[PDB]
């Protein structure tokens, strides 16, 4: 990855990347995009120097996106779930969809939906947790039940086995870097095995996925631009537009829109989908519309807590009004309500940001800038 190239040099205190004399230089556009991404990931500060989080990420041998997830995932014993998710995404999708099966016989279609439903109980709005369901459920399928499990649920056997092996290798890399017994750590199958996540754990996991893929978040087009794209209850879910965070505003906003994939868990839901969605990537293959490979849904304050670490989130001046007094302790310390803006700044009318819900925040003045410390 070009961001692996940039991140490594920054850990070497090589400041001038764009003009660096490579024997084989990457594109300047790619290098520039790499630097911005590492700024969104909190690896580089506003002056493009490596941070403490960046120094840790440089030690990992993975892509910086997944390196950022695994670092923030050692809370509330959520790490085994994240390792399974990262391993599944690294190896690929083990779900054979109805279109591939050519069943989009009626009895088989029923079993397909039952097979999908049992894995969807974790969360209504999230596809990434459906990957976590099969990968974790697989640890409870004995050796003689593997093939029966695969045929019954229409999964790919060889792809699932590779996921299980990758979990053990992947967990070693995380433990060795994080644990005080860096080299001595030995992984055991019972560490990989874990029970269902609690609702509090589910909410935390959504934030941890957001940590790696913060720049890949879209807002439903209705929220940002009401009436520019018609919306009503009869409309199907696959036709509801979404707008990525940094999309360049075209003269017709219809071009910027991205749409949910039919295979997603959202398609069968029926009620209106989430306003904010976190997606793994965008795919133009398939001429109907641009489609999202969705991960999960992120709420407003949880999203701001993630983008807080990067440079993709900006803060307004203190709000004043009924019951909005700005408590101030020191000339460089204050507590106030602020409305955060995520994405493009208001003065910037090229990229398409938006405003998040106001939230109380503890701010401390550094270098004349009121930097945020924590949310109240």
């Amino acid at each position: 990855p070009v961001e692996s190239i940039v991140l490594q040099m920054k850990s070497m205190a090589i400041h001038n990347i764009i003009n660096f004399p490579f024997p084989t230089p990457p594109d300047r556009v790619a290098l520039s995009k790499a630097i911005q991404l590492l700024q969104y990931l909190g690896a580089l500060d506003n002056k493009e120097m490596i941070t403490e989080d960046g120094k840790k990420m440089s030690l990992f041998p993975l892509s910086p996106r997944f390196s950022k997830m695994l670092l923030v995932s050692d809370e509330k014993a959520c790490l085994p779930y994240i390792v399974a998710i990262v391993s599944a995404l690294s190896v690929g999708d083990p779900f054979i969809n109805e279109f591939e099966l050519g069943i989009n016989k009626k009895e088989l279609r029923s079993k397909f939906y039952k097979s999908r439903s049992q894995f969807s109980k974790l969360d209504k709005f999230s596809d990434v947790f459906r990957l976590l369901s099969v990968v974790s459920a697989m640890d409870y399928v004995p050796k003689e039940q593997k093939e029966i499990f695969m045929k019954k649920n229409f999964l790919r056997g060889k792809l699932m086995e590779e996921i299980v092996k990758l979990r053990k290798q992947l967990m070693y890399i995380i433990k060795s870097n994080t644990s005080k017994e860096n080299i001595a750590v030995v992984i055991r199958n019972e560490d990989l095995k874990s029970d269902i996540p609690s609702v509090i754990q589910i909410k935390l996991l959504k934030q941890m996925i957001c940590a790696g893929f913060v720049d890949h978040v879209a807002v439903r087009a209705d929220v940002l631009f009401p009436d520019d794209a018609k919306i009503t209850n009869r409309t199907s879910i696959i036709n509801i537009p979404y707008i990525p965070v940094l999309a360049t505003r075209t003269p017709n906003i219809e071009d910027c829109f991205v749409y949910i994939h039919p295979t997603s868990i959202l398609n069968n839901l029926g009620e209106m989908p989430p306003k904010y969605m976190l997606y793994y990537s965008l795919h133009l293959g398939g001429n109907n519309k641009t489609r999202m490979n969705t991960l999960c849904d992120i709420a407003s304050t949880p999203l701001a807590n993630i983008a807080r670490k990067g440079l993709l989130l900006t803060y307004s001046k203190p709000l004043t009004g009924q019951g909005l007094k700005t408590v101030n302790l020191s000339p460089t310390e204050r507590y106030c309500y602020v409305v955060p803006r995520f994405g493009s700044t208001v003065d910037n009318d090229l990229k398409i940001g938006w405003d998040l819900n106001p939230i109380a925040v503890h701010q401390k003045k550094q270098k004349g800038q009121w930097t945020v410390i924590k949310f109240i």
Partner: peptide, 4 residues
């Protein structure tokens, strides 16, 4: 199993 719990996940199933």
């Amino acid at each position: 199993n719990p996940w199933l």
